Amino acid sequence: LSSSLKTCYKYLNQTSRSFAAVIQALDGEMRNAVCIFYLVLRALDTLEDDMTISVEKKVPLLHNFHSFLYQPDWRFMESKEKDRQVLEDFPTISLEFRNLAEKYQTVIADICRRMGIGMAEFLDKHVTSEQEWDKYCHYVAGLVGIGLSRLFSASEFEDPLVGEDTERANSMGLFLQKTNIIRDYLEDQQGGREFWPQEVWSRYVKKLGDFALPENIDLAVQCLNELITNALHHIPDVITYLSRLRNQSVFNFCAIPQVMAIATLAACYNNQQVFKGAVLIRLGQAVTLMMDATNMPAVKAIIYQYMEEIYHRIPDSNPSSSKTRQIISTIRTQ
Amino acid sequence: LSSSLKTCYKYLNQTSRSFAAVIQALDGEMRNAVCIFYLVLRALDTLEDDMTISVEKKVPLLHNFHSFLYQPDWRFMESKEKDRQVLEDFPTISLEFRNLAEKYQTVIADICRRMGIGMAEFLDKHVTSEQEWDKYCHYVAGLVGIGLSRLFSASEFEDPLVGEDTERANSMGLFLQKTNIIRDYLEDQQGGREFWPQEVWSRYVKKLGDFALPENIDLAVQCLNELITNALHHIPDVITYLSRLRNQSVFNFCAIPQVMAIATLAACYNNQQVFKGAVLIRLGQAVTLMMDATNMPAVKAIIYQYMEEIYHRIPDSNPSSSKTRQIISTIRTQ
Amino acid sequence: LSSSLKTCYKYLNQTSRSFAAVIQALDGEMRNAVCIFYLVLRALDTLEDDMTISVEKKVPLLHNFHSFLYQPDWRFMESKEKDRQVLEDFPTISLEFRNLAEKYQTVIADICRRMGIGMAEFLDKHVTSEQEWDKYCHYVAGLVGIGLSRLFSASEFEDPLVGEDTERANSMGLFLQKTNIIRDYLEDQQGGREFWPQEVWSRYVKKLGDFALPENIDLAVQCLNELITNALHHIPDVITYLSRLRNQSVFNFCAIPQVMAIATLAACYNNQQVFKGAVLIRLGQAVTLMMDATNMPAVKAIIYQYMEEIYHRIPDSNPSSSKTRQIISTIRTQ
Amino acid sequence: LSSSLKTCYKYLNQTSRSFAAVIQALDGEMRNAVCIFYLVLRALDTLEDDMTISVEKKVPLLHNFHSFLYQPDWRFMESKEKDRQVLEDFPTISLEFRNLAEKYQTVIADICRRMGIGMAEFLDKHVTSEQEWDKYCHYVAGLVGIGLSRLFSASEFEDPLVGEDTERANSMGLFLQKTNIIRDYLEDQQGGREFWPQEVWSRYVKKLGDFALPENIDLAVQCLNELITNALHHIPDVITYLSRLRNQSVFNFCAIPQVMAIATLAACYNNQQVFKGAVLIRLGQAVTLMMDATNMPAVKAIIYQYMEEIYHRIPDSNPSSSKTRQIISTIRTQ
Amino acid sequence: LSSSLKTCYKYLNQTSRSFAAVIQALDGEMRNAVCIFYLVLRALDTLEDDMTISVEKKVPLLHNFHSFLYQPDWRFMESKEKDRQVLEDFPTISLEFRNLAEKYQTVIADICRRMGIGMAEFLDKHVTSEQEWDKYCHYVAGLVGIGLSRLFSASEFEDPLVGEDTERANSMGLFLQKTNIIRDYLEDQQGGREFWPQEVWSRYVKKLGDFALPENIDLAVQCLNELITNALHHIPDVITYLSRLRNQSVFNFCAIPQVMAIATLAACYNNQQVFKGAVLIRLGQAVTLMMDATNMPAVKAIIYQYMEEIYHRIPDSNPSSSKTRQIISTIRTQ
Amino acid sequence: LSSSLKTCYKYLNQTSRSFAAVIQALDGEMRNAVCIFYLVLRALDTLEDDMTISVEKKVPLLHNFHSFLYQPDWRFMESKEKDRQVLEDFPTISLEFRNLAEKYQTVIADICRRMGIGMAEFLDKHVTSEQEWDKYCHYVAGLVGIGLSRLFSASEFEDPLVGEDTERANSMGLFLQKTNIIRDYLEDQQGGREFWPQEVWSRYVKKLGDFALPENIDLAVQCLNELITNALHHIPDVITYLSRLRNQSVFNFCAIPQVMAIATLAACYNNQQVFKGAVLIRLGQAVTLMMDATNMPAVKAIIYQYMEEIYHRIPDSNPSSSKTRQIISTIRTQ
Ligand SMILES: CCCCCCCCCCCCCCC[n+]1ccn(CC(P(=O)([O-])O)P(=O)(O)O)c1
């Protein structure tokens, strides 16, 4: 019941409007491990996002972030971002980090190290090919899924096979990040950041920003549907990853965010609203409301319902119509 | 791998308004077995329903349908029903049927044979007695529950007792079938098919179509309550059946349809809209919304809530009022 | 089987709108045991409630109620309350009480005895201190939690610890009761009933009724918030209690009311609507929408989420602001 | 049940003294899949062994054997080997192969195609280098390990990783094959078959048959120990492979053979009786006789005790003594 | 620790040749329940066995044995059997029986009653048709299986489905009983007791005692193999019954005896020794003596192995050979 | 990987005839922790036993042994014992010890400290009372069980209760040490050492060494039986301890030696061989022959059968006859 740990859960709730609850619901040692992992990841992400920090100053910070975890007094006072508090009071967070069992520390520091290098690499450039999209998503989210999987296994609450399957753990992260990148197009435009793959949107317009102009709305939706179709390809891996889980607290923690991401894609599919503001992630059909997302068979059913939601709205004229039906067919059939 | 299996799942979603998701969520071997079972039954159902097929031409098709499963090139191209695609492209479906392990084919083929016999038997006669209504329901639904039960046991996902207790399995089908027949009175009136037992409505009117007349509305609702009261007698068997299930995916699959059926009966009870149009399923109490139908105790609770919802709505002036309380009381006291 | 037992379940459904279904869903012997316990408490409640019964007659009735359970012919025919049926036909209920395994009777009678004495003590007084608030809530709710817990442990469907930790079981009762009391301020005002602790509301207004006056709305809300903060202190115990349960039917029974209570407090916090009418229970958002209260990890998540709903609304000007943050912060870190 | 499948199990029992029982004990789908896989591999092996078949007829037979699985009428009547029954009645076996799920079919056919290629390649030569020894074992045993692993994963009874980690699957086969080869030195000599690596035995004598001549025993045993030391290098992979298994029926199936092999290498190590007759696989040690190979920890314990048994009888004078100690040191230290 | 209970365990060990250990290994309350259930059955059987008792005197005893359990001072002193101590000191046994939970007492008392009735029924008549052989075994062993099954369920260490499946529990018993009878032809000979079905042996010789004559050895062995073939038909039910079990202590208790029975039938098939004195229980193979009978897959492999020992030694010239192969084939393929 | 860690396991295998394999099969960090713990204990043991070390020089070594763990270059070169290279190359061991986590280091050092003190104490005296026999066993074995139990709990592979209940953990050690002391009477004697309690043997002979004399064989066996009977009293604690373990690798590690000790007692009971040569463990029985020692119920069964092996061999005239029967009865009854 330390004051520093108290402060960490206070920061967790300040920064994680929607993950805090499921994290705090994790069994035993996973609870603190994941909470701290989230805080350090949040601090690292804040550094990356801060555009008042020059690239030459930022690179060292991203590269060396993992080592600060072991520097009791290290902190950063120049952030202007909204979640700067975890940076300004990082010693409180790093202290609890050093309080975690060594097995968790090793995993957390390793992920931070690798993520730092990955974030620095993409600072100067924009994502070009879809292969580079996967790479960038791997760095900022896939590594998180891998790190979490190792924490689950290290804790013994999940089978060691969970932490060992880096491929599907990576896909878990890729699906959430691609979804968020899809949904946040407009929010990111006004932020001066570009995440949509250039080799994909350049086939529709000259400037990614063009998707924001009312006269390019049809071309925007086509590209939107193409990127969503791309993201849906990770669902098989997601289902496979979730099917392996055996601990209920872990299952809830992993399954819920994925289903919310799926609901989000279904809501954004062929939706002009994506380019005019926030998308109305609305209700589902009477089968989704007779079963929640806390057991695998139910999670599958919920996922399939969302898939038919997209399937039924696929325009024949859409350049990606066949591939969209294809991946959904694959998900349905398995 | 199989592009034909994908087509089958495509058909499953085109023909199943709400079962596709839970069927696709079934564990291992049961997934394909139930998908294909559903499809052949749909094709058979389509033949029965087609009124452009004279009775003389139709009987041999119903009788030999179970054998067509082994005729690679067999198909039917003269149907005008909306699900005619499963008949026209039946070879794709029967191919996947022949790919199922033989122990599943045996079960499916047997139900198809027995169902053909029964459907043919009822082509030239309406349903008269209540015992005849059970007879018909057994033929088109009861056997499906028995078939599914034998598949569950043969797959070893459920206890051998599940497939052996043909009575409880039959009841699962009877409950759903009667519920739909009750609900679709009006829709069947325009289609020109009568399912409500003659011995029951013949005491309220001279022509089953009379309930359509807004002047006999009160007489209609009375008959409605009597049949609903009839259906409620299957519930104790449904509870017994569901309480023996141990596989979560099977449980979700079996429970949800039963719960949806019960909600429907509650919505239709002493409801006049049944004869004027679409009956809107009304939400449940605060407790039911707190739980989904995925664990036995929760399913019991949801079922009891729907019972009490019908109970405090029983008019003393209803000729069945006494019988309704009786069965509902028997359901409550176990 | 017996007509008296069904009569009991008929009464349960008439007098127990909120617990009937979950009680009937309980495993084995707990079913009848809790059904009867609820019926006898219902009768006791009805007597205490009935204002046409003189204090002279009521005191002896409350003190000796537990003994009526042993007198085969005892009944009361002078109640003017809606649920009087349980008093007039008490013989039927007492008969079933005597048919319960002796161990269950020991618990029900002991609770009725102590509850009667507690209710009699509060006939000629309102609630003064917060200490008297706990005392009162223990008499009408805490003891119920303790009795139920002892029944669970007696049935062996739960471990002995459940029935042994009376403090935690008591806390389950206090949380629900304080929540209802906070919620029903206005209704209880239009009923001449006072439950808000005078030692608390007197620090805001001269009379409790004043809170119903528009010019006092601000003081009323401050008081509302202080009491709510008081209620939140029982949450650690609620969590400890629920986390020890192992039976699904018992878990559904215990968890749902708690979640609904937390939701209520979340919706009532800093809400002026409490003093103008009945407050609309806000809906859970994001994670809470994808999970039901049927497994412990999910319930924790639901609870933590509603806690943040309150935390996000705490205005710095509120006099209890710091205390509200503190207890919540404690709930999060445990 | 089908008569052909019953016939397949009849052949399984005829051709597999040991494996038959553990194969029949495999859960669900793996039962028939492994039974059929074993039989076709038996038929292929029977053709590869038949020396009466002119290589002008043999190579195409081994190369195309995989294609015969799809030819209903194919069979081979010109064999005099003892298991010629599976060749003469191949249609019965291939029929059942075509009855297995497609996902198993592709695995079996693919392995048979590749094994066929490899067997034909080694028909005109003996093993030269140790690298050719691994290649040879890969073709006749390694591929079987890889095939079964793909069947285990496809059945979902084992993790996706079991099927993917082909290196480990390969090692399972290499270890059993090398073991049998080392142990069957004489039987091969009194048969005209040369399997021991040439580049290895040549450094000891001029002709492999020389190890049979009593005056070369000192060199024979020396060569024996080198080969054994070579095989021990697979044990680390065997432990890793076995450690991933989670299905008891599969574990029994996979573990038992490995333990018997390891025990064999223990009995043959530095034992000149290998060149005189048949070696007697004694019994476990004080501890090995207290545990069976049905759980991973026990299997590890058993493996270690055998390793230590070899470590003890290691001559300081033996040329491979240093290596033999190194490999064992690595195995016992993880 | 009760001294009467200690005495009961002293008797259990005295009256139990091979199963006292596994009974004492049973978890929790099953421990004493089964120990006492075995002692009372022991007494009940010792009564029927005693010939110094008249038929008209024995009948009432057997009929009321179940009632003696509730008569503290009841005891039989005129018996001169091997285990007469359980009769002379029955009060000690009944006392402990009366200390068992009522749920266990009901089961045990019920079985004794039904058993007593059945036993008396065969006091004057022999075993004629196999139909009657099953009726007999059902009374003296079959019912014991049902009893044990209900105790497992009542204790809750095993799923209620275990006690529910009376048919496979009955088979468990018939298999052991038929086995022992087959094995004890000689002992039952020097006792004047005939158990082999009349219709079966009479069809070989006119005097069932003939088989004790060297001149009818071949006539004998034939009848032997025929009866053994008869018993083998129970293996599918034994396998199915054992497969349902989930408790380890229950599994060891149920499986060990079944395996020993199978090993006995194996040793007795086509064996003259059966008519010359007790038979030896030969060795098995490594792929079993490397795994105890403590996990279902291992039990299956062990069973399948014994099935082969029978099959390999079936004489073409035996009148039942085809049927023997038939049932073994069915066991192998299922 | 670690050269020093490999050398460590090399010594573990040289100095541990019966623990190396089960130790190397321990999960996660228990593997190295236990390895090191066993190595340091072996070193401490090698010092106590070396008689080339004057008592005045031994006490300091024993008392400060625990401190040598933190002295990188401490070692011993004057030992003449066989396991002496664990002291000469002790820094290698101390190095790995310091590589372990603190929680593990804390435990080992604590036990090494407490053990050194105890050993030092019995350097001049011999065991007099049975009470001193326990104390002695406590210092050389009981503490080992406690240390190991605390290591299991710290690693968290087992619950806290394992390390807390020092009593049961102590018994585990006493049963093993007493069993070894009983078994090794002779070589201990031919080595000039005395461990049998004088208050027990002095009732039989004038000098413990007299049991080596042929003429005292009968008296030696009587004493042997009295000591064995004493050891048997720890069996209840052994079963309790084992029945609380939850990790398979931990269970195997703990159960195998105990079952080995029990078998040893059963073989030494009333056996003159104990005073002449070596006692060959006459294996278990045919019921426990189908059971290994890797699951609790089987372990119980194996233990109960060995108890009966002893029970049936108890001589009526043996002075401890009653005591032996008494404790065996207690074990049967629980
Ligand atoms: C086993 C499943 C694992 C899924 C892992 C998905 C990882 C997705 C990237 C997470 C990177 C760590 C957090 C970096 C800071 N960050 C940015 C956004 N967020 C999410 C927060 P938000 O943007 O909404 O303020 P919230 O939705 O949790 O409240 C957190």
mmCIF file of N, CA and C in Angstrom, chain B residues 285-287 289-292 294-298 300-302 304-305 308 311 326 329-334, chain C residues 1-2 5-6 9-10 13-14 17-18 21-22 24-27 31 248-249 252 256 259-260 292-294:
data_model
loop_
_atom_site.group_PDB
_atom_site.id
_atom_site.type_symbol
_atom_site.label_atom_id
_atom_site.label_comp_id
_atom_site.label_asym_id
_atom_site.label_seq_id
_atom_site.Cartn_x
_atom_site.Cartn_y
_atom_site.Cartn_z
ATOM 1 N N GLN B 285 -36.106 -7.258 -17.591
ATOM 2 C CA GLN B 285 -35.940 -6.578 -16.311
ATOM 3 C C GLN B 285 -34.483 -6.144 -16.154
ATOM 4 N N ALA B 286 -34.177 -5.461 -15.059
ATOM 5 C CA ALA B 286 -32.820 -4.992 -14.817
ATOM 6 C C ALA B 286 -31.823 -6.137 -14.634
ATOM 7 N N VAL B 287 -32.253 -7.202 -13.962
ATOM 8 C CA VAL B 287 -31.392 -8.356 -13.704
ATOM 9 C C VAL B 287 -30.966 -9.126 -14.957
ATOM 10 N N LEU B 289 -30.662 -8.097 -18.006
ATOM 11 C CA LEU B 289 -29.713 -7.309 -18.781
ATOM 12 C C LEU B 289 -28.325 -7.353 -18.147
ATOM 13 N N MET B 290 -28.264 -7.781 -16.889
ATOM 14 C CA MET B 290 -26.999 -7.877 -16.167
ATOM 15 C C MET B 290 -26.280 -9.180 -16.499
ATOM 16 N N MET B 291 -27.011 -10.109 -17.107
ATOM 17 C CA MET B 291 -26.456 -11.408 -17.467
ATOM 18 C C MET B 291 -26.877 -11.892 -18.851
ATOM 19 N N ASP B 292 -25.968 -12.591 -19.519
ATOM 20 C CA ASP B 292 -26.234 -13.130 -20.844
ATOM 21 C C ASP B 292 -26.497 -14.627 -20.695
ATOM 22 N N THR B 294 -25.192 -17.493 -21.129
ATOM 23 C CA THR B 294 -24.024 -18.355 -21.333
ATOM 24 C C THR B 294 -23.596 -19.244 -20.172
ATOM 25 N N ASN B 295 -24.367 -19.233 -19.093
ATOM 26 C CA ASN B 295 -24.119 -20.134 -17.981
ATOM 27 C C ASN B 295 -25.519 -20.556 -17.544
ATOM 28 N N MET B 296 -25.651 -21.819 -17.165
ATOM 29 C CA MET B 296 -26.936 -22.394 -16.781
ATOM 30 C C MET B 296 -27.749 -21.625 -15.731
ATOM 31 N N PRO B 297 -27.115 -21.215 -14.618
ATOM 32 C CA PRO B 297 -27.882 -20.477 -13.612
ATOM 33 C C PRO B 297 -28.469 -19.184 -14.169
ATOM 34 N N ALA B 298 -27.716 -18.518 -15.041
ATOM 35 C CA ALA B 298 -28.189 -17.271 -15.627
ATOM 36 C C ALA B 298 -29.345 -17.534 -16.592
ATOM 37 N N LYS B 300 -31.489 -19.944 -16.320
ATOM 38 C CA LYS B 300 -32.657 -20.240 -15.494
ATOM 39 C C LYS B 300 -33.326 -18.935 -15.060
ATOM 40 N N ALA B 301 -32.518 -18.026 -14.525
ATOM 41 C CA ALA B 301 -32.980 -16.727 -14.052
ATOM 42 C C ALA B 301 -33.708 -15.954 -15.151
ATOM 43 N N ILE B 302 -33.106 -15.898 -16.332
ATOM 44 C CA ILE B 302 -33.696 -15.192 -17.464
ATOM 45 C C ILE B 302 -35.039 -15.828 -17.826
ATOM 46 N N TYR B 304 -36.992 -17.567 -15.786
ATOM 47 C CA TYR B 304 -37.954 -17.296 -14.735
ATOM 48 C C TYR B 304 -38.493 -15.875 -14.861
ATOM 49 N N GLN B 305 -37.627 -14.927 -15.203
ATOM 50 C CA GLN B 305 -38.076 -13.551 -15.364
ATOM 51 C C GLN B 305 -39.141 -13.461 -16.448
ATOM 52 N N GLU B 308 -42.535 -14.853 -15.056
ATOM 53 C CA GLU B 308 -43.247 -13.917 -14.195
ATOM 54 C C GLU B 308 -43.835 -12.782 -15.030
ATOM 55 N N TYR B 311 -46.959 -14.251 -16.234
ATOM 56 C CA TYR B 311 -47.815 -14.531 -15.092
ATOM 57 C C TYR B 311 -48.628 -13.344 -14.572
ATOM 58 N N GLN B 326 -50.853 -22.817 -13.781
ATOM 59 C CA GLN B 326 -50.469 -24.174 -13.419
ATOM 60 C C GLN B 326 -49.098 -24.578 -13.968
ATOM 61 N N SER B 329 -46.342 -22.399 -12.597
ATOM 62 C CA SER B 329 -46.070 -22.757 -11.210
ATOM 63 C C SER B 329 -45.199 -24.011 -11.179
ATOM 64 N N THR B 330 -45.443 -24.918 -12.120
ATOM 65 C CA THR B 330 -44.677 -26.158 -12.201
ATOM 66 C C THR B 330 -43.248 -25.864 -12.641
ATOM 67 N N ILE B 331 -43.090 -24.817 -13.445
ATOM 68 C CA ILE B 331 -41.779 -24.414 -13.947
ATOM 69 C C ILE B 331 -40.949 -23.771 -12.833
ATOM 70 N N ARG B 332 -41.617 -22.996 -11.986
ATOM 71 C CA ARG B 332 -40.977 -22.305 -10.874
ATOM 72 C C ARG B 332 -40.537 -23.212 -9.737
ATOM 73 N N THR B 333 -41.384 -24.169 -9.389
ATOM 74 C CA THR B 333 -41.089 -25.081 -8.298
ATOM 75 C C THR B 333 -40.214 -26.243 -8.763
ATOM 76 N N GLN B 334 -39.593 -26.073 -9.927
ATOM 77 C CA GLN B 334 -38.711 -27.078 -10.523
ATOM 78 C C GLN B 334 -39.523 -28.077 -11.343
ATOM 79 N N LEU C 1 -43.122 -29.954 -5.163
ATOM 80 C CA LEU C 1 -44.013 -31.107 -5.191
ATOM 81 C C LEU C 1 -45.281 -30.799 -4.390
ATOM 82 N N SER C 2 -45.106 -30.390 -3.133
ATOM 83 C CA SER C 2 -46.236 -30.059 -2.265
ATOM 84 C C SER C 2 -46.858 -28.744 -2.715
ATOM 85 N N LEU C 5 -45.244 -25.645 -1.005
ATOM 86 C CA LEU C 5 -43.993 -25.135 -1.548
ATOM 87 C C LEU C 5 -44.238 -24.273 -2.791
ATOM 88 N N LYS C 6 -45.175 -24.677 -3.648
ATOM 89 C CA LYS C 6 -45.467 -23.889 -4.843
ATOM 90 C C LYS C 6 -46.113 -22.569 -4.447
ATOM 91 N N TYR C 9 -43.465 -20.244 -3.674
ATOM 92 C CA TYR C 9 -42.836 -19.675 -4.861
ATOM 93 C C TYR C 9 -43.786 -18.678 -5.528
ATOM 94 N N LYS C 10 -45.089 -18.861 -5.338
ATOM 95 C CA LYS C 10 -46.036 -17.909 -5.898
ATOM 96 C C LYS C 10 -45.830 -16.595 -5.139
ATOM 97 N N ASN C 13 -42.521 -14.713 -6.057
ATOM 98 C CA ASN C 13 -42.655 -13.964 -7.304
ATOM 99 C C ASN C 13 -43.534 -12.710 -7.184
ATOM 100 N N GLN C 14 -44.515 -12.735 -6.286
ATOM 101 C CA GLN C 14 -45.391 -11.580 -6.103
ATOM 102 C C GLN C 14 -44.706 -10.525 -5.243
ATOM 103 N N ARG C 17 -39.857 -8.879 -6.674
ATOM 104 C CA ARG C 17 -39.654 -8.540 -8.070
ATOM 105 C C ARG C 17 -38.172 -8.572 -8.459
ATOM 106 N N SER C 18 -37.309 -8.144 -7.545
ATOM 107 C CA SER C 18 -35.875 -8.080 -7.815
ATOM 108 C C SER C 18 -35.029 -9.338 -7.576
ATOM 109 N N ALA C 21 -36.160 -14.424 -9.574
ATOM 110 C CA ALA C 21 -35.449 -15.199 -10.594
ATOM 111 C C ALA C 21 -34.094 -15.776 -10.148
ATOM 112 N N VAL C 22 -33.229 -14.946 -9.571
ATOM 113 C CA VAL C 22 -31.920 -15.421 -9.131
ATOM 114 C C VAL C 22 -32.008 -16.405 -7.966
ATOM 115 N N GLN C 24 -34.553 -18.532 -7.498
ATOM 116 C CA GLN C 24 -35.034 -19.768 -8.084
ATOM 117 C C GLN C 24 -33.951 -20.429 -8.920
ATOM 118 N N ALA C 25 -32.919 -19.670 -9.276
ATOM 119 C CA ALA C 25 -31.817 -20.208 -10.076
ATOM 120 C C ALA C 25 -30.727 -20.826 -9.197
ATOM 121 N N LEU C 26 -30.845 -20.664 -7.884
ATOM 122 C CA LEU C 26 -29.857 -21.198 -6.953
ATOM 123 C C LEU C 26 -29.791 -22.726 -6.933
ATOM 124 N N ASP C 27 -28.579 -23.264 -6.821
ATOM 125 C CA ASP C 27 -28.369 -24.713 -6.775
ATOM 126 C C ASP C 27 -28.914 -25.426 -5.542
ATOM 127 N N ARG C 31 -31.873 -23.182 -2.828
ATOM 128 C CA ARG C 31 -33.077 -22.707 -3.492
ATOM 129 C C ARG C 31 -34.238 -22.500 -2.527
ATOM 130 N N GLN C 248 -21.438 -20.596 -9.169
ATOM 131 C CA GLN C 248 -21.993 -19.661 -10.145
ATOM 132 C C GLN C 248 -23.400 -19.146 -9.811
ATOM 133 N N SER C 249 -24.283 -20.012 -9.323
ATOM 134 C CA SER C 249 -25.632 -19.566 -8.985
ATOM 135 C C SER C 249 -25.572 -18.573 -7.820
ATOM 136 N N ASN C 252 -24.029 -15.123 -9.180
ATOM 137 C CA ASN C 252 -24.997 -14.312 -9.909
ATOM 138 C C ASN C 252 -25.897 -13.578 -8.920
ATOM 139 N N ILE C 256 -24.841 -9.250 -8.946
ATOM 140 C CA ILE C 256 -25.742 -8.338 -9.637
ATOM 141 C C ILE C 256 -26.277 -7.171 -8.801
ATOM 142 N N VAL C 259 -23.482 -4.640 -8.184
ATOM 143 C CA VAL C 259 -23.165 -3.868 -9.383
ATOM 144 C C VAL C 259 -24.231 -2.803 -9.623
ATOM 145 N N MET C 260 -25.494 -3.187 -9.459
ATOM 146 C CA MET C 260 -26.608 -2.262 -9.657
ATOM 147 C C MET C 260 -26.576 -1.130 -8.638
ATOM 148 N N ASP C 292 -20.794 -8.865 -18.746
ATOM 149 C CA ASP C 292 -21.852 -8.982 -17.751
ATOM 150 C C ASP C 292 -21.238 -9.303 -16.391
ATOM 151 N N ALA C 293 -22.024 -9.187 -15.332
ATOM 152 C CA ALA C 293 -21.500 -9.461 -14.002
ATOM 153 C C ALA C 293 -21.605 -10.934 -13.629
ATOM 154 N N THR C 294 -20.964 -11.812 -14.398
ATOM 155 C CA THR C 294 -21.041 -13.239 -14.105
ATOM 156 C C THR C 294 -19.722 -13.918 -13.763
#
